[PDB]
């Protein structure tokens, strides 16, 4: 599924990401834009041979199992494939654990490089939430 901006904002809010660990909704929508372009089916191979999955590009090195990332953990206890669903529940539940890990949203290098410190409220402009 390719989400609309406001469509994704609404889904993340419903799932309690708005101001989760103090990150306003625009931060999450901004991260998803630059990680996935709002595409649940996005996959990207990392240099270390781990893979990033879904709207928030969650890494197989720590968070999900893909059966092909030697020495990896599955701290969200999910197949990485669950992170590609049109239903963002698994991505969101896993993202709550990641952002709670101690480095907050810096875990998402694209958030740190492209969203951090910017006018992230612009990402929810116009949305009926
Ligand atoms: Na893994």
Structure method: X-ray
User: b or e along 86-114 (b: 16 or more beta carbons within 10 Å of the residue's beta carbon)?
Assistant: eebebbbebbeebbeeeebbebbebbeee
Q: How many residues does the chain have?
A: 129
Report CA(115)–ligand 1 centroid distance (Å): 27
> What residues contact 14, with CB distance under 8 A and at least 6 apart?
none
> Alpha-carbon distance 86 to 55, whole Å?
10
Q: Which uninterrupted H or E stretch holds 96?
A: helix 89-99
- Tell me whether residue 35 is one of the annotated catalytic residues: yes
Joined tokens for residue 104:
């907050």
Resolution in A: 1.6
Domains, the chain, ordered by start: 1-129 (1.10.530.10)
Helix axes 5-14, 25-36, angle to 10 degrees: 130
- Tell me whether residue 7 is one of the annotated catalytic residues: no
């Amino acid at each position: 599924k390719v989400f609309g901006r406001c469509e994704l904002a609404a889904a993340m809010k419903r799932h309690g990401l708005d101001n989760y660990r103090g990150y306003s909704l625009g931060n999450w929508v901004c991260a998803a834009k630059f990680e996935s372009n709002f595409n649940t089916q996005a996959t990207n191979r990392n240099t270390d041979g781990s893979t990033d999955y879904g709207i928030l590009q969650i890494n197989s090195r720590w968070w999900c199992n893909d059966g092909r990332t030697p020495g990896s953990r599955n701290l969200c206890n999910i197949p990485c494939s669950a992170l590609l669903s049109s239903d963002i529940t698994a991505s969101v539940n896993c993202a709550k654990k990641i952002v709670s890990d101690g480095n907050g949203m810096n875990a998402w290098v694209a958030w740190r490089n492209r969203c951090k410190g910017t006018d992230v409220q612009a990402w929810i402009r116009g949305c009926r939430l």
